Copies of this chain bind each other. A is one copy, B any other.
Amino acid sequence: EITCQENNPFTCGNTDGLNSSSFEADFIFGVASSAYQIEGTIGRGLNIWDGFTHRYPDKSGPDHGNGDTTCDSFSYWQKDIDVLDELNATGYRFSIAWSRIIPRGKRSRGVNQKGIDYYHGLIDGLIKKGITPFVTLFHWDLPQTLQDEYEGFLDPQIIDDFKDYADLCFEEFGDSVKYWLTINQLYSVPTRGYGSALDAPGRCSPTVDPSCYAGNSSTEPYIVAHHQLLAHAKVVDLYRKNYTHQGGKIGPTMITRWFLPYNDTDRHSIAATERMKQFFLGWFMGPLTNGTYPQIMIDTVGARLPTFSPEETNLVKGSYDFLGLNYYFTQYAQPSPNPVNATNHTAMMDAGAKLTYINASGHYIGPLFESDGGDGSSNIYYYPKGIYSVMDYFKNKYYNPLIYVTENGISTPGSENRKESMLDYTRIDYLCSHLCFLNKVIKEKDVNVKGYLAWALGDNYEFNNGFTVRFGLSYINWNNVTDRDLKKSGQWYQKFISP
């Protein structure tokens, strides 16, 4: 009988009690990163995260930082492999920057052979060290040219451009890469990129944010989500029909959260909680498992929800070999009005829920996850049991998928100095408390989870936050980015992996 802690203090940092041996022999342990966040712009074309951060610098982060040079994994990819080697990691999730290998967006315009070599050297070097690549095709960094030609995922033209790009990756790397992710966190771009405009490309309704250059927060998140699902499904079909000889697997990435009722004896809060599961998870998992959106979405969103043709439904349904599930935290849900007529309406209001980290009787859901200066009431708190509830829900509701936890991690303030940043005990607590529950749900519920990749390999540019927070298990000095030094969390993880 496995017992896991939900509340500080945690004791799962002791590798006597919890380590990789607790898991099956073949279970993959590693870390993750993404191209925009680590590589730098050297050697690649420009993408909408360059566009967005440069046009709207106050949305790139409070320090206006961006991915221009960041930790320069373009130059220092070997140092990233050295961190993985030191961890004795068996997996590394990284993304290919579309702009690095097809700077002009559309493949017929030519490929950047040097960009293709960069990823060949990286993939080799990982394989030389026994590290299994999990490669994300699209971690949000859409070539700027496509956003300017037809507004990227707002237009069905993205489907063939994304397909041709994916085809080049499979052809160039698929002999060595056996685990592909199509689109990172399906929920994020539609909502943050086209709904609240916190993220690239930064489209939204005029009264949601006057700085958006265009958009409609009420309709575009549904259009973009729909094209994501079709583009993803066309790539998975290309992969399974044309690259089956490579003997690899492909899946989408979901951002997952669990949801609990803000008041667990109030039927309206219970209803809001189940609506959140459908609107947050089901928006994508319903198409991915059934070829259709959830009924509550169909009913609420009405004419703003696109339909799949029969052919499209069939393409999308079952379009994965596994699911890359990212998990960070859980929210309480209470009812909220859905003012579909307000000029500031967003797709996110359609769920009819308000999300918090404190429930009706004042209980905070768990330990601090992220502090906010501009609003202490806007702090995020985490919930280790959330990973157990998510995995169990995916096995039960979504047909017992093969899962890899493709991100899980926590930030520490960028204010902290080097010695404080290195002593990141809060990160050990976050990681181990989640790993405890993950082992617990695999053993108790028999969820088919086969790996875990902590976010992040090293400190990097964090979307929306610049360099004001750090997520790395290894520390990077922004005055001299060459080194990646294992923090206490990375040293703990090294011992967890090889106890």
Question: Which listed residue, B42, B69, B103, touches A148 by the CB 8 Å rule?
Answer: B103
Report if A110 contacts B (CB, 8 A).
Answer: yes
10 new A-B contacts at CB < 8 Å, known A41-B55, A55-B103, A68-B68: A41-B54, A41-B57, A42-B57, A45-B55, A45-B148, A46-B46, A46-B51, A50-B54, A145-B145, A145-B149
Q: Contact between B214 and A46 (Cβ–Cβ < 8 Å)?
A: no
Residue of B nearest to A115 (CB): B213
Q: Which residues of B contact A69 (CB under 8 A)?
A: 57
Q: Give 16 pairs: A residue, B residue, CB < 8 Å, sorted on A.
A: A41-B54, A42-B57, A44-B55, A45-B51, A45-B144, A46-B50, A46-B51, A54-B68, A57-B69, A68-B68, A103-B148, A104-B148, A105-B148, A145-B145, A145-B149, A149-B149
What are the 10 tightest A-B residue pairs by CB atom distance, in nearest-first order? A145-B148, A41-B54, A104-B148, A145-B145, A46-B46, A46-B51, A46-B144, A42-B57, A144-B144, A105-B148
Residue of B nearest to A56 (CB): B42
Scoring A residues 168 to 202 as 1 if CB is less than 8 Å from chain B, else 0, what string do you get? Answer: 00000000000000000000000000000000000
What is the bound-complex CA distance between A349 and B144, given in angstroms? 35
Scoring A residues 29 to 73 as 1 if CB is less than 8 Å from chain B, else 0, what string do you get? Answer: 000000000000111111000110011110000000000110000
Which A residues contact B (CB, under 8 angstroms)? 41-46, 50-51, 54-57, 68-69, 103-105, 109-110, 112, 143-145, 148-149, 213-214
Q: Which residues of B contact A50 (CB under 8 A)?
A: 46, 50, 54
Q: Which residues of B contact A145 (CB under 8 A)?
A: 144-145, 148-149
Q: Which residues of B contact A41 (CB under 8 A)?
A: 54-55, 57
Least Cβ–Cβ distance between A40 and chain B, in angstroms: 8
What is the bound-complex CA distance between A57 and B74, given in angstroms? 13
What is the bound-complex CA distance between A42 and B55, given in angstroms? 4
**Residue among A54, A68, A148 with the highest chain B CB neighbour number at 10 A:** A148
Q: Which residues of B contact A214 (CB under 8 A)?
A: 110
Least Cβ–Cβ distance between A45 and chain B, in angstroms: 7
Q: Contact between B68 and A43 (Cβ–Cβ < 8 Å)?
A: no
Question: Which listed residue, B44, B68, B148, touches A143 by the CB 8 Å rule?
Answer: B148
What is the bound-complex CA distance between A46 and B99, given in angstroms? 14
Residue of B nearest to A58 (CB): B42
Least Cβ–Cβ distance between A263 and chain B, in angstroms: 44
Least Cβ–Cβ distance between A288 and chain B, in angstroms: 32
What is the bound-complex CA distance between A144 and B69, given in angstroms? 20
Least Cβ–Cβ distance between A121 and chain B, in angstroms: 17
